[PDB]
Amino acid sequence: IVTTLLEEPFVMFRKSDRTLYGNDRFEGYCIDLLKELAHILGFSYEIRLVEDGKYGAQDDKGQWNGMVKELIDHKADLAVAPLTITHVREKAIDFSKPFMTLGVSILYRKPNGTNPSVFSFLNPLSPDIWMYVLLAYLGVSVVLFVIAR
Amino acid sequence: GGIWWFFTLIIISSYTANLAAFLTVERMESPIDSADDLAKQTKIEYGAVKDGATMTFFKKSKISTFEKMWAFMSSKPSALVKNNEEGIQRTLTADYALLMESTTIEYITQRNCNLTQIGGLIDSKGYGIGTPMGSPYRDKITIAILQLQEEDKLHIMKEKWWRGSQKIGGIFIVLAAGLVLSVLVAV
Amino acid sequence: LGVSILYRKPNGTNPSVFSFLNPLSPDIWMYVLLAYLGVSVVLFVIARALSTRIIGGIWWFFTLIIISSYTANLAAFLTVERMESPIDSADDLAKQTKIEYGAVKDGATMTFFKKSKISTFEKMWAFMSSKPSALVKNNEEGIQRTLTADYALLME
Amino acid sequence: GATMTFFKKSKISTFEKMWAFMSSKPSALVKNNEEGIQRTLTADYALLME
């Protein structure tokens, strides 16, 4: 049993127009990997979409959910998924070797730039006070020219 | 003229003071490349997937930066995303970075060129295949893992399936206006 | 005795001459020299006093902006440059992210900081437990890690 | 000190980090208040006091 959910790049719809159910529904790296596993070890596989869409975790009580609860209830005995190995998960099921070693990072967009416009130079001073500068110079000119002529 | 000369000195020193103030705001605001930034900022939300082993591990944090992160993320349950796509669209649209594992972030930033890695990885952590407690076929799984890695199918197919698919210059126009302004004076 | 902390000296400092106009964009100066030779050629534009006083006032205001702006960028660099803690005590290590700190594999300092149950020292030990390579065989390996990596050491 | 033991059992995190810095400093604790008078009126040192 493969309890699973739609997850790139692991679980993607196998590109076909046909009405498909079970193993031939999906395409992915782990899909052909599971084909290889059923080949070499001689078993076979069944792929099932999980209802709640969960890895599996105890609640505030201790009730496991998701694919881990599908494993513990023995309705599933494998769960092909990006399953992170943690020790609380270790004391419910049996993890294999680390086959995709990784770690959590942070992703965000690329702003990486500004628009320091000619509009933007005014900002530490009020535009009416920017006008007061101009009108003060005009007042100085119109007094001193009356002084001149 | 001494009065007006002093007056315009007050004017230019005042706007000089305010412009220097904003420059220092920009310079103290110059850029952030570490987690400690989110430990110091407050205006950028950040969250994690519910039933995420990442979120469970942030509950188990014994790192002061990451513990303040867990305290804020527990204070903001809207940051605790249900699916990835909630955090994805909030990262696309709003001021919101997201904690996620290296391989998936890597495969998306290779696909989506709109993105970049923020900071680095936390530590090393791997994937496992869970047989239930008492089912011995995990050892066959282990033999097949040692096989297909030692047969180099895992690394080569991991390579294959993961396809990598001015205010500096703002014043010179106002300067060049005087070139044509001097034409229309006398001749 | 007491445990102490050793660190290295980066000291990446280089003064004038070349440190001088770096806050200013060095390609503004060709645009400066364009208008400079344009003001020098005014001796021949008029040849072959409102029209010159407007040039004087515009250029007067124009260059009044520039020196204040670059001085502002200078002091804006300077004060932020005056903000170096950098490592007064290990509380920074209780708050940093990049400087690794640790002790010896089977070390007496390692023993004590497993024993140390001050909560700040507990989280320093939690750092050390999070690092697979903060623990070293000998003190010389710690010397190697200090010289190579950004590493502080809880040596004697 | 009763205040010393009081912040030994501080359950206020700001005061707990003050106590954490006090745990970092064995020289923070003195023998009597007169030694606090000494360290204050000689060195750059303040003292919590009733």
> What is the full DSSP assignment across A27-95?
ESHHHHHHHHHHHHS-----EEE-SS-------SSS---HHHHHHHTTS-SB--S--B--HHHHTTEE-
Q: Do chains D and B touch (3 or more CB pairs under 8 A)?
A: no
Rounded Cα gap, residues C45 and C126, in angstroms: 76
For residue B167, which residues of chain A lie inside 8 Å, CB to CB?
116, 120-121
Residues 6+ apart with CB under 8 A from B32: B41
D40 annotated ligand binder: no
Assess A110–B contact: CB distance below 8 Å, yes or no. Answer: yes
Nearest to A52 by CA among A98, A20, A102, A4: A4
Helix and strand totals (H; E) in chain D: 3, 0
- Inspect the interface and report whether the beta carbons of D16 and C119 lie closer than 8 Å: yes
CA distance C75 to chain B (A): 8
Q: What is the dihedral of CA A117, A119, A120, A124, to 10 degrees?
A: 160
Angle at C84 between CA C83 and CA C86, to 5 degrees: 150
Dihedral sign for Cα atoms in the order B51, B57, B61, B65 = negative
Rounded Cα gap, residues B151 and C153, in angstroms: 42
Angle at C76 between CA C71 and CA C79, to 5 degrees: 120
In terms of CA atoms, which chain B residue is nearest residue C60? B175
How are beta strands B45-49 and B96-101 bridged, if at all?
A: parallel
| B55 sits in which H/E element | helix B53-59
Residues C139 and C104: beta-carbon distance below 8 Å? yes
Q: Hey, is B140 helix, strand or coil?
A: helix
Q: Hey, is C27 helix, strand or coil?
A: coil
Q: Is C17 exposed, middle or buried (0-12, 13-18, 19+ CB in 10 A)?
A: exposed
HSE-up of residue C72 (Cα within 13 Å, Cβ side)? 21
Rounded Cα gap, residues A149 and B21, in angstroms: 43
Residues C80 and B27: beta-carbon distance below 8 Å? yes
How are beta strands B80-81 and B45-49 bridged, if at all?
A: parallel
CA A131 to chain centre: 50
Q: Where are the alpha helices (DSSP H) in B62-137?
A: 64-75, 84-93, 102-111
C111 annotated ligand binder: no
The residue behind tokens 């180099």 is B152
Resolution rounded to one decimal, in angstroms: 7.4
Rounded Cα gap, residues D40 and D43, in angstroms: 5
Buried/exposed C33-50: b ≥16 CB within 10 Å, e otherwise: eebeeeeeeeeeeeeeee
Helix and strand totals (H; E) in chain C: 6, 2
A116: preceding bond cis by omega (within 30 degrees): no
Residues B35 and A106: beta-carbon distance below 8 Å? yes
C156 annotated ligand binder: yes
Residues A50 and A5: beta-carbon distance below 8 Å? yes
The residue behind tokens 């082993």 is B53
Residues A96 and B128: beta-carbon distance below 8 Å? yes
Residues 6+ apart with CB under 8 A from A72: A64, A92, A93, B132, B133
Dihedral sign for Cα atoms in the order C58, C61, C67, C73 = negative
Assess A93–B contact: CB distance below 8 Å, yes or no. Answer: yes
Compute φ and ψ for C21, nearest 5 degrees.
-100, 15
Q: Which of B64, B177, B181 is closest, CB to CB, to C95?
A: B64
- Best mutation target among D8, D10, D13, D24 (most C Cβ atoms within 10 Å) is D24
Method used to determine the 3D structure? cryo-EM
Q: How far is CA C110 from each of CA A20, C100, C104, rounded to the nearest angstrom?
A: 60, 14, 6
For residue B175, which residues of chain C lie inside 8 Å, CB to CB?
35, 58-59, 62
Q: Is A28 exposed, middle or buried (0-12, 13-18, 19+ CB in 10 A)?
A: buried
